[PDB]
Design a protein around this ligand. Structure first.
Ligand code: SF4
Ligand code: FES
Ligand code: FES
Lengths: 159, 411
């Protein structure tokens, strides 16, 4: 519960550049982004100091935490299978893959493996509908996967 | 892909042409293009930029192109971002000089990451490319680029919100009356537009205005990236002229199966928001944007969704609202109701528990819901909701008759 943004901070320091003159709000977005890399499941303590780098009151940063879907509150399977449940993808019949997948994966759609390599998300639109099913694995991307194929895809990281 | 394909496409060859221009000359140049907004706003592209008409203010202006569209696909905007990034870049450089902004920021889609990186990297080659910057392209006006990853807001999509995302502070629409859209986000003058506008506008200028402009019915000017997703064999992006046959489009798709034919029923033409269609209606397109409205069509997104006959009408549309359900940004007190009322309301129909009237009732909610709003995105989402009642609900009204079956099924 003691996050440090120092060593990679110089990289972080550039983030400081992006706006002109007054304010560091622009940094805000950048900052949190830097953080998720630093630890995932980032924690309030990390925020506050980030605010110092930010130079803004906590709630102000706190208002920011609410809004952006991206930042993650606790911890996720390092594998974080974002599974899109939105219409289009639904139109893909995708939904069955997730259900079949959940059985394969082992936790209610809501949970993550006690192994903790993964952390499923019901996700809404991944902004790749032509490609449905689309699976975003960690930083990376997986496109239209067969149930057997989906299992195989889960497999390799699983190794 | 990267610089050689970038060099290779022979992007920016014009750009040299650009230096010589002609920006007032360019700007009318679009008007001959009579460039309307590509996102769906339609206001004169020339009209929008022209609006800047900056004169002198202390602050710098800024221009930004969305690279981010979450419309729920087809992800046409994303694909454009990937294949020939630089071409976007050149367009960005070229147009911006037109407004005469010192530099531009492009804010990307939240889901994309690896996808996002290539764009900056192509962006990196730009300083490396040496096309313009500092003193630039034999042009005094400065050039600067910044790209910012994103939080992940479909709400972030609203222009007030998009400008606000840059703000990165609880995005909402700024206040509609106040803009003066250019002034003063990120503290100053700044006009915005959809990316395709940002880049395509660059090519057209290099090309004679007439070649792009001549193409299609005068309802719609030049060309469009159409994309389709459907219960049919082929789905994807097809770069096509405005004003072509939908069924002809269906043929390009090789959409499965038939159509009208085995099976029905409707297509949401733009993306999801504009009014859905019916099997009888489909013969009508003709997908020129002006063409849609009279229909009550409005394929602003230019990404079709085919919604197949063998499905519950309530079942797909209802799943669809949820996204609207996720959507609410929170700025309007009423829209919390907006998603609510509908979504909870929506579910009952889907379960088929609810009584006859409620169908009518929803309609009432719609107009009031549509009565006024901060957005915009919200308004659009509701409106798509509305057409649901006519046609498919008109069909659903029967579908609801199926709910009756639930009512029969009651004991
Ligand atoms: S209608 Fe909803 S999404 Fe749009 S500004 Fe109002 S509260 Fe936000
Ligand atoms: S619906 Fe899953 S990506 Fe748009
Ligand atoms: S909007 Fe007028 S009372 Fe709050």
């Amino acid at each position: 519960x003691x996050x440090x943004x120092x060593x990679x901070x110089x990289x972080x320091x550039x983030x400081x550049x992006x706006x002109x003159x007054x304010x560091x709000x622009x940094x805000x977005x950048x900052x949190x982004x830097x953080x998720x890399x630093x630890x995932x499941x980032x924690x309030x303590x990390x925020x506050x100091x980030x605010x110092x780098x930010x130079x803004x009151x906590x709630x102000x940063x706190x208002x920011x935490x609410x809004x952006x879907x991206x930042x993650x509150x606790x911890x996720x399977x390092x594998x974080x299978x974002x599974x899109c449940x939105x219409x289009x993808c639904x139109x893909x019949x995708x939904x069955x893959x997730x259900x079949x997948x959940x059985x394969x994966x082992x936790x209610x759609x809501x949970x993550x493996x006690x192994x903790x390599x993964x952390x499923x998300x019901x996700x809404x639109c991944x902004x790749x509908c032509x490609x449905x099913x689309x699976x975003x694995x960690x930083x990376x991307x997986x496109x239209x996967x067969x149930x057997x194929x989906x299992x195989x895809x889960x497999x390799x990281x699983x190794x | 892909x990267x610089x050689x394909x970038x060099x290779x496409x022979x992007x920016x060859x014009x750009x040299x042409x650009x230096x010589x221009x002609x920006x007032x000359x360019x700007x009318x140049x679009x008007x001959x293009x009579x460039x309307x907004x590509x996102x769906x706003x339609x206001x004169x592209x020339x009209x929008x930029x022209x609006x800047x008409x900056x004169x002198x203010x202390x602050x710098x202006x800024x221009x930004x192109x969305x690279x981010x569209x979450x419309x729920x696909x087809x992800x046409x905007x994303x694909x454009x971002x990937x294949x020939x990034x630089x071409x976007x870049x050149x367009x960005x450089x070229x147009x911006x000089x037109x407004x005469x902004x010192x530099x531009x920021x492009x804010x990307x889609x939240x889901x994309x990451x690896x996808x996002x990186x290539x764009x900056x990297x192509x962006x990196x080659x730009x300083x490396x490319x040496x096309x313009x910057x500092x003193x630039x392209x034999x042009x005094x006006x400065x050039x600067x680029x910044x790209x910012x990853x994103x939080x992940x807001x479909x709400x972030x999509x609203x222009x007030x919100x998009x400008x606000x995302x840059x703000x990165x502070x609880x995005x909402x629409x700024x206040x509609x009356x106040x803009x003066x859209x250019x002034x003063x986000x990120x503290x100053x003058x700044x006009x915005x537009x959809x990316x395709x506008x940002x880049x395509x506008x660059x090519x057209x200028x290099x090309x004679x205005x007439x070649x792009x402009x001549x193409x299609x019915x005068x309802x719609x000017x030049x060309x469009x990236x159409x994309x389709x997703x459907x219960x049919x064999x082929x789905x994807x992006x097809x770069x096509x002229x405005x004003x072509x046959x939908x069924x002809x489009x269906x043929x390009x798709x090789x959409x499965x199966x038939x159509x009208x034919x085995x099976x029905x029923x409707x297509x949401x033409x733009x993306x999801x928001x504009x009014x859905x269609x019916x099997x009888x209606x489909x013969x009508x397109x003709x997908x020129x944007x002006x063409x849609x409205x009279x229909x009550x069509x409005x394929x602003x997104x230019x990404x079709x969704x085919x919604x197949x006959x063998x499905x519950x009408x309530x079942x797909x549309x209802x799943x669809x609202x949820x996204x609207x359900x996720x959507x609410x940004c929170x700025x309007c007190x009423x829209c919390x109701x907006x998603x609510x009322x509908x979504x909870x309301x929506x579910x009952x129909x889907x379960x088929x528990x609810x009584x006859x009237x409620x169908x009518x009732x929803x309609x009432x909610x719609x107009x009031x819901x549509x009565x006024x709003x901060x957005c915009x995105x919200x308004x659009x989402x509701x409106x798509x909701x509305x057409x649901x009642x006519x046609x498919x609900x008109x069909x659903x009204x029967x579908x609801x008759x199926x709910x009756x079956x639930x009512x029969x099924x009651x004991x």
